Amino acid sequence: YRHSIFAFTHVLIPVWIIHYYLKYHVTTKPYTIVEKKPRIFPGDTILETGEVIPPMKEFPDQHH
Amino acid sequence: GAHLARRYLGDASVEPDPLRMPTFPPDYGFPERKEREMVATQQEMNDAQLVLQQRDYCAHYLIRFLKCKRDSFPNFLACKHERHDWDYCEHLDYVKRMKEFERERRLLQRKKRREQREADMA
Amino acid sequence: YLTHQQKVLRLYKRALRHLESWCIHRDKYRYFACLLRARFDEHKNEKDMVKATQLLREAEEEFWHGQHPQPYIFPESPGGTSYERYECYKVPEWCLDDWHPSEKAMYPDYFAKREQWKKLRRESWEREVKQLQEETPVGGPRTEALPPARKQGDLPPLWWHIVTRPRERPM
Amino acid sequence: HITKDMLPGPYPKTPEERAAAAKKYNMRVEDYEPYPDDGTGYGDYPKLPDRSQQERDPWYDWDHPDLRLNWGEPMHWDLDMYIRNRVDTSPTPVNWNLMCKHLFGFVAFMLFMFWVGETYPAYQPVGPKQYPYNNLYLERGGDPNKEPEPVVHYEI
Amino acid sequence: DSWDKDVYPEPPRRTPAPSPQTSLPNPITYLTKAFDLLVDRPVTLVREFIERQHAKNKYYYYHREFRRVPDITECQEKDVLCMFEAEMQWRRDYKVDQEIVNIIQERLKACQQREGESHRQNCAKELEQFTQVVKAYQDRYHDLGAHYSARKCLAKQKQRMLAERKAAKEAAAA
Amino acid sequence: GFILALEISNMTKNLKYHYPSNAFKFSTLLGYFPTIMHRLAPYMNLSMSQKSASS
Amino acid sequence: MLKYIIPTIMLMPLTWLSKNNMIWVNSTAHSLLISFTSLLLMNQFGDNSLNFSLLFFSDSLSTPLLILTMWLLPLMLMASQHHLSKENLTRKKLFITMLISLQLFLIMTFTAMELILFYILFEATLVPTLIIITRWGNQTERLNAGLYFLFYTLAGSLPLLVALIYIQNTVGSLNFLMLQYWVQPVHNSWSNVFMWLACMMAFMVKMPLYGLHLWLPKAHVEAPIAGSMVLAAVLLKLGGYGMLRITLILNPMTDFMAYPFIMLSLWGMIMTSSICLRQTDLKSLIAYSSVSHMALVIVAILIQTPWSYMGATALMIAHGLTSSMLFCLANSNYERIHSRTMILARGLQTLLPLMATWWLLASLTNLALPPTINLIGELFVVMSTFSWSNITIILMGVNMVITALYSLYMLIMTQRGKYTYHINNISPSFTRENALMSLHILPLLLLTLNPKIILGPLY
Amino acid sequence: TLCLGAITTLFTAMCALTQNDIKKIIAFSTSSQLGLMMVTIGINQPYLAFLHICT
Amino acid sequence: SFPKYEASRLSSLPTTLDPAEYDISSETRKAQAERLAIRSRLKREYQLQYYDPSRRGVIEDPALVRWTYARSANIYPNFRPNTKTSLLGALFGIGPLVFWYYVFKTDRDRKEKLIQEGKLDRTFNISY
Amino acid sequence: TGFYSKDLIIEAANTSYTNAWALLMTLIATSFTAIYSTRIIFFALLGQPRFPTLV
Amino acid sequence: SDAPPLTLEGIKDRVLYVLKLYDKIDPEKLSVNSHFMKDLGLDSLDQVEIIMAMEDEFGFEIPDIDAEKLMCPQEIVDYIADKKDVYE
Amino acid sequence: KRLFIIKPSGFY
Numbered sequence A: 001y002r003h004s005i006f007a008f009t010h011v012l013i014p015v016w017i018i019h020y021y022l023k024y025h026v027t028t029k030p031y032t033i034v035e036k037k038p039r040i041f042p043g044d045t046i047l048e049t050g051e052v053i054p055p056m057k058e059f060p061d062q063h064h
Numbered sequence B: 001g002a003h004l005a006r007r008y009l010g011d012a013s014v015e016p017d018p019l020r021m022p023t024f025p026p027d028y029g030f031p032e033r034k035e036r037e038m039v040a041t042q043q044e045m046n047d048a049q050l051v052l053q054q055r056d057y058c059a060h061y062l063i064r065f066l067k068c069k070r071d072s073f074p075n076f077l078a079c080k081h082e083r084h085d086w087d088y089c090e091h092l093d094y095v096k097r098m099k100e101f102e103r104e105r106r107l108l109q110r111k112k113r114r115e116q117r118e119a120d121m122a
Numbered sequence C: 001y002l003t004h005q006q007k008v009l010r011l012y013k014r015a016l017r018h019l020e021s022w023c024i025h026r027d028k029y030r031y032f033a034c035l036l037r038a039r040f041d042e043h044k045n046e047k048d049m050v051k052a053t054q055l056l057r058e059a060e061e062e063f064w065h066g067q068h069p070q071p072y073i074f075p076e077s078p079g080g081t082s083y084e085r086y087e088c089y090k091v092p093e094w095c096l097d098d099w100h101p102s103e104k105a106m107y108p109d110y111f112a113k114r115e116q117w118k119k120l121r122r123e124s125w126e127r128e129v130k131q132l133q134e135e136t137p138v139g140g141p142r143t144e145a146l147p148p149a150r151k152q153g154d155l156p157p158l159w160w161h162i163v164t165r166p167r168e169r170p171m
Numbered sequence D: 001h002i003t004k005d006m007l008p009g010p011y012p013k014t015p016e017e018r019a020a021a022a023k024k025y026n027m028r029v030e031d032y033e034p035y036p037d038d039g040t041g042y043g044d045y046p047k048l049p050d051r052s053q054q055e056r057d058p059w060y061d062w063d064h065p066d067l068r069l070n071w072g073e074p075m076h077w078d079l080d081m082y083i084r085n086r087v088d089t090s091p092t093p094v095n096w097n098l099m100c101k102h103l104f105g106f107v108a109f110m111l112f113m114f115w116v117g118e119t120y121p122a123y124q125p126v127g128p129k130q131y132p133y134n135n136l137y138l139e140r141g142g143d144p145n146k147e148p149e150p151v152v153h154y155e156i
Numbered sequence E: 001d002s003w004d005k006d007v008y009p010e011p012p013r014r015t016p017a018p019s020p021q022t023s024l025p026n027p028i029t030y031l032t033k034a035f036d037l038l039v040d041r042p043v044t045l046v047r048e049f050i051e052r053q054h055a056k057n058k059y060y061y062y063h064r065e066f067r068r069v070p071d072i073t074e075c076q077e078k079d080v081l082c083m084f085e086a087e088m089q090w091r092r093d094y095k096v097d098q099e100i101v102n103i104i105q106e107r108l109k110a111c112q113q114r115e116g117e118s119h120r121q122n123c124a125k126e127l128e129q130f131t132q133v134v135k136a137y138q139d140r141y142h143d144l145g146a147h148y149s150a151r152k153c154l155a156k157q158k159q160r161m162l163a164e165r166k167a168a169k170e171a172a173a174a
Numbered sequence F: 001g002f003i004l005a006l007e008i009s010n011m012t013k014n015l016k017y018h019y020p021s022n023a024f025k026f027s028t029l030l031g032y033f034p035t036i037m038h039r040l041a042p043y044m045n046l047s048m049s050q051k052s053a054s055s
Numbered sequence G: 001m002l003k004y005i006i007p008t009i010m011l012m013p014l015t016w017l018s019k020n021n022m023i024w025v026n027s028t029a030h031s032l033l034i035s036f037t038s039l040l041l042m043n044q045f046g047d048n049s050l051n052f053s054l055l056f057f058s059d060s061l062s063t064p065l066l067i068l069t070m071w072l073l074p075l076m077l078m079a080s081q082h083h084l085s086k087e088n089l090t091r092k093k094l095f096i097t098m099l100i101s102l103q104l105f106l107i108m109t110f111t112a113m114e115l116i117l118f119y120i121l122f123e124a125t126l127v128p129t130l131i132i133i134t135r136w137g138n139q140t141e142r143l144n145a146g147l148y149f150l151f152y153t154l155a156g157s158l159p160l161l162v163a164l165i166y167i168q169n170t171v172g173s174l175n176f177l178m179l180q181y182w183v184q185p186v187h188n189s190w191s192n193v194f195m196w197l198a199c200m201m202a203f204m205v206k207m208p209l210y211g212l213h214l215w216l217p218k219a220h221v222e223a224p225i226a227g228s229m230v231l232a233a234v235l236l237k238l239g240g241y242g243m244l245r246i247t248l249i250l251n252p253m254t255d256f257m258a259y260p261f262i263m264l265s266l267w268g269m270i271m272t273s274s275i276c277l278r279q280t281d282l283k284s285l286i287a288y289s290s291v292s293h294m295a296l297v298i299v300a301i302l303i304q305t306p307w308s309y310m311g312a313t314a315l316m317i318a319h320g321l322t323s324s325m326l327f328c329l330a331n332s333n334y335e336r337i338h339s340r341t342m343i344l345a346r347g348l349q350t351l352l353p354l355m356a357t358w359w360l361l362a363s364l365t366n367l368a369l370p371p372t373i374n375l376i377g378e379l380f381v382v383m384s385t386f387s388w389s390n391i392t393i394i395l396m397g398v399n400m401v402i403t404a405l406y407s408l409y410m411l412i413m414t415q416r417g418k419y420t421y422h423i424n425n426i427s428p429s430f431t432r433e434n435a436l437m438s439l440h441i442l443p444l445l446l447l448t449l450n451p452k453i454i455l456g457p458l459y
Numbered sequence H: 001t002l003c004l005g006a007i008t009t010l011f012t013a014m015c016a017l018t019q020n021d022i023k024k025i026i027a028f029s030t031s032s033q034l035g036l037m038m039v040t041i042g043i044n045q046p047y048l049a050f051l052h053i054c055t
Numbered sequence I: 001s002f003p004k005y006e007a008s009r010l011s012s013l014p015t016t017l018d019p020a021e022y023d024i025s026s027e028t029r030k031a032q033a034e035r036l037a038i039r040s041r042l043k044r045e046y047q048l049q050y051y052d053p054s055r056r057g058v059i060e061d062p063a064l065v066r067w068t069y070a071r072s073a074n075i076y077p078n079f080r081p082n083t084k085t086s087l088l089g090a091l092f093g094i095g096p097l098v099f100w101y102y103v104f105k106t107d108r109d110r111k112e113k114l115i116q117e118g119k120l121d122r123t124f125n126i127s128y
Numbered sequence J: 001t002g003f004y005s006k007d008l009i010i011e012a013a014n015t016s017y018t019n020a021w022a023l024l025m026t027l028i029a030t031s032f033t034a035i036y037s038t039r040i041i042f043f044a045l046l047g048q049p050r051f052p053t054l055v
Numbered sequence K: 001s002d003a004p005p006l007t008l009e010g011i012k013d014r015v016l017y018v019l020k021l022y023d024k025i026d027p028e029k030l031s032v033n034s035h036f037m038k039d040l041g042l043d044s045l046d047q048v049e050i051i052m053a054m055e056d057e058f059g060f061e062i063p064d065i066d067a068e069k070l071m072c073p074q075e076i077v078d079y080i081a082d083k084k085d086v087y088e
Numbered sequence L: 001k002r003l004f005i006i007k008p009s010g011f012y
């Protein structure tokens, strides 16, 4: 009960305020939140357009 | 290492100069050396956000390793197979640098021998 | 000043503690503590004040050259890691006169006793002044020692702050 | 409400004045030593030993324990500098002159050795790192309009 | 939309599709599901309630427009009534020019963060545009001083035109 | 270092006197850097502030 | 400005016609309302200043100084109540009258549009200031302090009058708006060198400039608390405000005539900061602290860069609140022990726990702890002076070190340590004193959230 | 930075070989550890230096 | 036997090693009687007021007042302009001003040329 | 925890173009770390209790 | 800081408990009101080290000015108790 | 055995 109340008035209400703040006041202005572009690796699938990058060139198989 | 004495407490031309290597031409000494290739491509390395110092011939194994880390999360006690592939390729690349160094070290002595012989006799 | 007996006594205490610092281990300290005592035992009495000073001056020079650079210090002594650590918690008693009545009412017993001390302190002050101007030469006192009360029911002169001083660990 | 006859005055000329000054400052006429009459505005203020308050008897019942002063005692001209927070003039285990030599010697030795180690670097035997695509010309921001000076590395 | 995409460009995102290989469940996905329910939902409803209240009362504010007036060049010497309007116009342009540089700087910094490690190459139209505008801004407004004015701005230009005009004459003669 | 530390540490238990090495007092007093700088620079600065700057 | 001039004048009838025991309640209550209405001056535009009439105007420079000036009068009334407790009723009313008239001249000085109207009101502030020091000061030295204050200012002001009247004859006007358009460059001749000096030395003596400051330790120490608060907070800023205006008509001669004055200020920072480390008087230590912060203002006005003027404006407002608070804090102790010696009372943090929190906050702002506006103004001046010359970073840096030392030296000397045994009359802080300290620090810290309103015209 | 760390990672460790106070001994360990971090920065290994902070 | 102690300005001579604490003549000990005699008299005067229960305020210490009055208000009346005061004043007062003027004037004259000639890098410098 | 950062640093320091004297001090300091580290254990854990009787 | 306080009985017991471990006084003849120089026949140098063993027991130094005034075990109890504010 | 802790007046 003590932790439930603490997790409500210190982790749940503040995140509501922050998420409401970020989602509807900060993200509505240019470049306020800038996220580094996700890394794309050879042989992936893009969710936005379905593109399938070619896997790779064949490797000179090694060992050890 | 062990050649610092040979660079300071000994002869100079015997030991190469790291800031200026390579000194001799890139072909003289071998029968048409095969140009080192690169499995990865610029567009692929650019899209993987590899650090610039990692944009070497050893790439295309780091790219494989990075995919395993993202595709195995959370399995940080795994993907060790790809770790050695990139590490091993890095190990071979370092050997070539020593092989480049050893080549330079001898050719300087060979230049010493040729100059010494022609100079001493005349 | 400090006579000649006291200087050797002070030097002996310092020498052991500095020696105790070098030795660390108790068994070594006991072995050397008695050895250093013997070197004092050799030259006990011996009269010849002129030669007595020479032995002490040589002793002080030897102590200075061999003293520990970082002698052990008691935690609550000048130089210690806990010296004056509680001076910030020591509040005088005259501040209680400035308390608000609403917070004196939290301690009806304590301030009842204070009135007795304050009442006691006022009544005894006049005698303390008399006790001091009678037991003092014409040219003012020549020592910092104070006389006790030469009577029953008379408190010693100048006792209020000595008695009522803050406790060593007030909080 | 202190009168002008109980306040510091000019340098005493006759021995009689030096007697009044010593009595004024609560000192023995023998111990009362005015500062030199060099004209820096010292007047007849007593010159006390340049001993910090940190080297006063910690156990004596001072009227001002933190300042190590006694009520009515003549204060040193530089008392504020010699309080127990600022300047310590206590004897040290090592002589002052010997301390400076050791500290300067250590720093002087160390600085020279760093310079020696700067002109004689330690490095493992390896050729310069080789990178593809004209040594990462395009990756390092090189403009893709001017032709880069070609660079080629060969296997070996 | 919230802002004009032309002024503040944004390369399209490319989020790779998840391709898990380990059998373990990714905790982030579960936390994402929980977050969408305990945080994203209640916030969305409260905003929608407030959003509707802003549709019942809808009043508008407008971007002030200042019609151009004669610049300091056409102002008669020591004519305050003409110099005043030109000076006031110049100051507004000065503030506008300051914000234009801020826009280009913001685009430059967004690119350096959007492109990650590959920012030195992928950010070339941003660095170039920033360099050009700063050079333009510096020539217009720099070294004027705290008591800057249209008159001081004009004199700086005229000395740059003379310096550049003389250089052209020397080059032309060759 | 552990081997050197252990044997040197054990010597403290050998019943015997010692010598006051200067290199020991150099490290005990932190190279004398505090004793000099924290006693000289305050004196110079605080003497100048009163004799030159003010008086 | 008649919406502020007239009500200030009405504070005089209010004080004299009020009940005998209610003089402090009405003047404090109604002067606070005048301060509230001063917030209407913030109707500032990006291109044009707020010009009211032919006589008065208010740009972003005058506005923060006006709001500050009208905010101090209620504060100075609170600080004066204790030491005027046994004062004759009529004389007590004459004291409140001097403070009201001083505000009346200040609010007309900062808003005057014509430079001779500025001079008359700029010079008129001496009479109410001189009377407060010489009449309601404590020590014998007030008389000599009054003479030093009077004749240092006039020795500079009188040449300024000859220069101002000369400029009108040549230019035909002294209206500040006119000068912005009719200004002409100043040729390098011996005649103009002395015009430059006459237009600045009056303002330099009031900043004050190092070398010409041997009235601030006398006036700011021998004056009553109300005199010290206004002397330090608003009267030093008249010289700063004057220079920020008259440098408009001195270009380009300010390029080389500023060197001897930048050196005095740059090296005057260290000299005055060092003096604070050895002061045996809590009020004199705070007074010398003003000469160091105003030395940054002189350098900021003499290099003429957009950042320097923004830094100069912020510094003047920040210093006014901090210095006024420091004098108030030093006075609260003096009202108990009735002595200015800094070492007499120690360890006061054990007897006045809350008043020691006000000491800490005042010291933190004094040493320019970010993000307080003291740091914002000081930082913007180091940035500007760095571009003026990269070597100035050395002198700016050393002063920041010494500034922290003497600020915390007085905090440690008077708050920490061990209480003086024979000091047994340290009564708890009154609500008046605590409210007095809050009314300084709270607005000073709130300005950090919206600092653009104190950055001046070049924002 | 390489030399600045090296002097600190050595001088402060040297001062710790003879300190008695338990807190002071651990303090001189921090300075030596910080000096090592500076050496890491001096050899162009910023991420190793960051890792040393966390560990 | 052992090396002597070298006393410096910031390192006083230890009282034990001072060759005056051992020998105690008739007059030398008599002086220490007066020092303790006077200083014990003040200790008495202080304690009379200190312990008094009918005293509330500050025990004014005339020694403290004389200290501050000598440090601030008694300096100028005891000042004589002579070789030391004049030479020290000129060096400390005017020397630094002249030294700093040439450091900054020389620095700014050099920097001014590099800007007129276009040899100073100011590509992105638009904040002054 | 220390191994995964400190050891990697020393390997990179040794095998990198670097100041020779600075590298030496780093290696010496690591040895000096063990000496004062052991000083704590011996004088606090090992040996016999040197603290007062009533504890 | 969690250290149990000191009582008058506890102080007296420890003062004698340390002297009784001293190989210079007869335990049977050792009384609280027993001098050190006039009853038990001890030299001043022995007295000085009496304090050191006394200080190391209570863990706090005694001034040398006030150290050379404790000639009876009862006086030690008075000094140690008074310094540490022990009343019952 | 609770003792009285002397503090300055915290009411004001």
Ligand SMILES: C[C@H](CCC(=O)O)[C@H]1CC[C@H]2[C@@H]3[C@H](O)C[C@@H]4C[C@H](O)CC[C@]4(C)[C@H]3C[C@H](O)[C@]12C
Pocket: A002, A003, A005, A006, A009
């Ligand atoms: C949760 C925590 C400890 C619980 C535990 O025993 O594990 C307890 C200790 C004291 C409590 C806090 C105190 O009661 C003070 C606050 C008042 C209310 O209790 C709710 C929030 C509040 C902040 C509490 C949150 C939580 O219940 C706390 C923080």
Ligand SMILES: *C(=O)CCCCCCCCCCCCC
Pocket: B001, B002, B004, D122, D123, D124, J014, J015, J023
């Ligand atoms: C080359 O870069 C070596 C530089 C010195 C670092 C290694 C020093 C320690 C060598 C110990 C092994 C020596 C061979 C017995």
Ligand SMILES: [Zn+2]
Pocket: G082, G083, G334, G335, G336, G338
């Ligand atoms: Zn009062």
